[PDB]
Design an enzyme around this catalytic site. Structure first.
Site, PDB file in Angstrom:
ATOM      1  N   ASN A   1       0.814  -1.203   0.000  1.00  0.00           N
ATOM      2  CA  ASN A   1       0.000   0.000   0.000  1.00  0.00           C
ATOM      3  C   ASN A   1       0.860   1.271   0.000  1.00  0.00           C
ATOM      4  O   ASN A   1       1.766   1.383  -0.825  1.00  0.00           O
ATOM      5  CB  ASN A   1      -1.124  -0.007   1.079  1.00  0.00           C
ATOM      6  CG  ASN A   1      -0.645  -0.321   2.492  1.00  0.00           C
ATOM      7  OD1 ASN A   1      -0.093  -1.380   2.768  1.00  0.00           O
ATOM      8  ND2 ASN A   1      -0.900   0.603   3.405  1.00  0.00           N
ATOM      9  N   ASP A   2       0.603   2.223   0.886  1.00  0.00           N
ATOM     10  CA  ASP A   2       1.353   3.486   0.896  1.00  0.00           C
ATOM     11  C   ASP A   2       2.839   3.483   0.548  1.00  0.00           C
ATOM     12  O   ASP A   2       3.594   2.625   1.005  1.00  0.00           O
ATOM     13  CB  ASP A   2       1.263   4.164   2.267  1.00  0.00           C
ATOM     14  CG  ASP A   2      -0.144   4.254   2.796  1.00  0.00           C
ATOM     15  OD1 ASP A   2      -0.305   4.779   3.920  1.00  0.00           O
ATOM     16  OD2 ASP A   2      -1.075   3.811   2.099  1.00  0.00           O
TER      17      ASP A   2
END
Ligand SMILES: *[C@H]1O[C@H](CO)[C@@H](O[C@H]2O[C@H](CO)[C@@H](O[C@@H]3O[C@H](CO[C@@H]4O[C@H](CO)[C@@H](O)[C@H](O[C@@H]5O[C@H](CO)[C@@H](O)[C@H](O)[C@@H]5O)[C@@H]4O)[C@@H](O)[C@H](O[C@H]4O[C@H](CO)[C@@H](O)[C@H](O)[C@@H]4O[C@H]4O[C@H](CO)[C@@H](O)[C@H](O)[C@@H]4O)[C@@H]3O)[C@H](O)[C@H]2NC(C)=O)[C@H](O)[C@H]1NC(C)=O
Ligand SMILES: *[C@H]1O[C@H](CO)[C@@H](O[C@@H]2O[C@H](CO)[C@@H](O)[C@H](O)[C@H]2NC(C)=O)[C@H](O)[C@H]1NC(C)=O
Ligand SMILES: *[C@@H]1O[C@H](CO)[C@@H](O)[C@H](O)[C@H]1NC(C)=O
Length: 537
Positions: free
Chosen positions: A18-19
């Site tokens: 993710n991020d």
């Protein structure tokens, strides 16, 4: 086997990502860290995975740099940012989850500064440096994602962390003289009632006129006007927004420019699937690069099945536009190094109402295309409705099957032979008012017919484009098997979408130029570049 894995977008060999975390440049080497799950295709066991590059396109693997090993991050090592200290030493501030599941802010530094790949990082025994407690009253469940820090005139460092109090989004500011002892500031750098939690904050300077990037701590000069961008990821809507304004260093507060409000009404970097974006200053070429995470639009079952989930878009250079009302974005020029030597061209092709032109001689599932549209007699454009303000809803209620004066006209990407499947990226022109000479340009990314599989999220995206139809409309699209990155008006409107066609895969995918509007349009020029795969982690 893996029809949806990208050939030139960053993503791990497997599992959930993710991020993007701590993007930075050190000793001429670009670094990318990212939230990764070492043993699953869904979020979990999150750690900071690591990769390095010299061109921001080709990435080399490295062992996880930050992972649970102490009380201050025993339950997780969440997102954060990298700051390059004056002495040239890079440091990382990340959010960790403590024994009671509280979000705290920890510092990490390289163990060997002589290692240009910064493979090993150590975590201060003084951690956490900033934490939620009864003294500061910060929400222990909504206090995360420290940004890169910047040095103040008083020689004191500033950093903000995303947070909230009830429904009020907050950019909690902390200051420090040694980067170790951090004092919470009485007032936040900014806030907004009703927005909800503010995640992955970002605060950086941009030059008033020019596309060059600006060092994060740079001050405004009497002869050099600098604007400041405040960016936050709204947890409630899953979109990234930003506002342009000034920085009151006296009260240490951000001041949005007229017409800007840090909430769901502000502009977005990307109007499709894009979240937790973060920039860094590339001192190597004087530009600011933006990293953005694009999750899967497929079902979780499909994710678990393919063994992975999540990709980063192609990093892009960002700067202030001349009008000073928005930011412009463009993929880093290094990505162009993937374009095949021989390009497919098409000039002065008149697209008649309801016609389409196929672009041959190019890997339609992994390419880069740039088209120039030239509209005919704009007076024929329909008059947009006065109340219409949501670009997405307009694209939804007036999909590709709905004709109008000018448009839908644009491109059909990741399409099958007989268009059984296709992702439509197009323009639609509206007249501001009756007899008016002002026109509204809408950009749509329609994936309602992107795949035969129904479990895929085929939400359609839309965005207005700040360009004059009187001049040729510019459109670019990066096609990479299951991701499409569309750029309208030379980067004034960006839309990223994820599609998983059952037929338009690999060699069986096609590319088309089309015009389903009543008024025929002219394709001044079109360049399709097959894109070579990059060597990524
Ligand atoms: C990464 O992960 C996912 C992407 O995979 C993403 O999560 C969200 O993505 C979309 C937001 O961009 C959400 O899309 C919505 O889907 C709704 C349609 O769903 C389908 O139909 C049924 C629902 O009505 C149902 O059979 C299935 O969906 C399930 O619905 C339930 C709801 O009870 C939900 O809880 C489940 O999770 C399922 O999703 C079907 O798949 C749809 O209603 C939404 O569309 C409206 O809004 C969009 C704009 O967002 C607009 O373009 C449409 O026109 C439509 O507008 C309505 O309202 C108007 C009023 O203004 C009306 O005029 C008009 O007639 C319409 O009624 C929307 O497309 C998706 O649901 C969601 N996915 C999940 C599972 O969470 C994450 O955001 C992303 N993560 C990050 C961090 O990026
Ligand atoms: C901050 O902590 C959490 C952050 O999510 C908040 O808890 C949520 O509160 C909302 C109501 O606004 C509920 O709808 C959610 O179900 C709650 N989720 C969680 C995390 O339990 C909490 O309300 C906030 N507390 C304060 C006073 O800021
Ligand atoms: C530190 O890193 C440099 C560059 O990778 C390497 O040459 C050197 O041996 C390392 N020193 C040690 C042993 O930590």
């Amino acid at each position: 086997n893996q029809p949806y894995r990208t050939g030139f977008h960053f993503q791990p060999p497997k599992n959930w990502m993710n991020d993007p975390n701590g993007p930075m440049i050190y000793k001429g080497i670009y670094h990318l860290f990212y939230q990764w799950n070492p043993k699953g295709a869904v979020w979990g066991n999150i750690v900071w995975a690591h990769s390095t590059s010299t061109d921001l396109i080709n990435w080399d693997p490295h062992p996880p740099a930050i992972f649970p090993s102490a009380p201050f991050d025993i339950n997780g090592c969440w997102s954060g940012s990298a700051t390059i200290l004056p002495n040239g030493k890079p440091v990382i501030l990340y959010t960790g989850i403590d024994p009671k599941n509280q979000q705290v802010q920890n510092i990490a530094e390289p163990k060997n500064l002589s290692d240009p790949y910064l493979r090993e990082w150590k975590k201060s025994p003084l951690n956490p440096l900033m934490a939620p407690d009864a003294v500061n009253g910060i929400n222990a469940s909504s206090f995360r994602d420290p940004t890169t820090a910047w040095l103040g005139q008083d020689k004191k460092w500033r950093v903000i962390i995303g947070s909230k109090i009830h429904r009020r989004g907050l950019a909690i500011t902390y200051t420090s003289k040694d980067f170790l002892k951090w004092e919470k500031s009485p007032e936040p750098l900014h806030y907004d009632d009703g927005s909800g939690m503010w995640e992955c904050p970002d605060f950086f300077p941009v030059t008033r006129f020019g596309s060059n990037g600006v060092e994060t701590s740079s001050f405004g000069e009497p002869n050099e006007i600098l604007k400041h961008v405040l960016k936050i990821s709204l947890d409630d809507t899953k979109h990234d927004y930003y506002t342009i304004g000034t920085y009151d260093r006296v009260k240490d507060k951000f001041v949005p420019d007229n017409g800007f409000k840090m909430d769901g009404t502000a502009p977005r970097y990307d109007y499709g699937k894009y979240y937790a974006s973060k920039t860094f200053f590339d001192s190597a070429k004087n530009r600011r690069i933006l990293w953005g995470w694009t999750n899967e639009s497929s079902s979780v079952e499909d994710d678990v099945e393919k063994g992975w989930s999540g990709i980063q878009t192609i990093p892009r250079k960002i700067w202030l536009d001349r009008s000073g009302k928005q930011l412009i974005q463009w993929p880093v020029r290094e990505v162009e190094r993937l374009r095949t030597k021989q390009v497919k061209n098409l000039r002065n092709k008149v697209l008649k109402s309801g016609s389409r032109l196929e672009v041959y001689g190019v890997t339609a599932a992994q390419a880069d295309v740039e088209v120039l549209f030239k509209v005919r007699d704009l007076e024929k454009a329909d008059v947009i409705e006065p109340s219409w303000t949501d670009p997405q809803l307009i694209c939804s209620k007036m999909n590709v099957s709905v004709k109008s004066g000018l448009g839908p006209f644009g491109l059909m990407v990741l399409a099958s032979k007989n268009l059984e499947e296709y992702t439509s990226v197009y323009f639609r022109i509206f007249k501001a008012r009756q007899n008016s000479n002002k026109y509204v340009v809408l950009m749509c990314s329609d994936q309602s017919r992107s795949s035969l599989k129904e479990d895929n999220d085929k939400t359609t995206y839309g965005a207005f484009v700040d360009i004059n139809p009187h001049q040729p409309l510019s459109l670019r699209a990066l096609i990479d098997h299951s991701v499409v990155e569309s750029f309208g008006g030379k980067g004034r409107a960006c839309i990223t979408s994820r599609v998983y066609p059952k037929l338009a895969i690999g060699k069986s995918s096609h590319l088309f130029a089309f015009n389903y509007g009543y008024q025929s349009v002219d394709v001044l020029n079109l360049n399709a570049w097959s894109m070579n795969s990059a060597q990524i982690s």
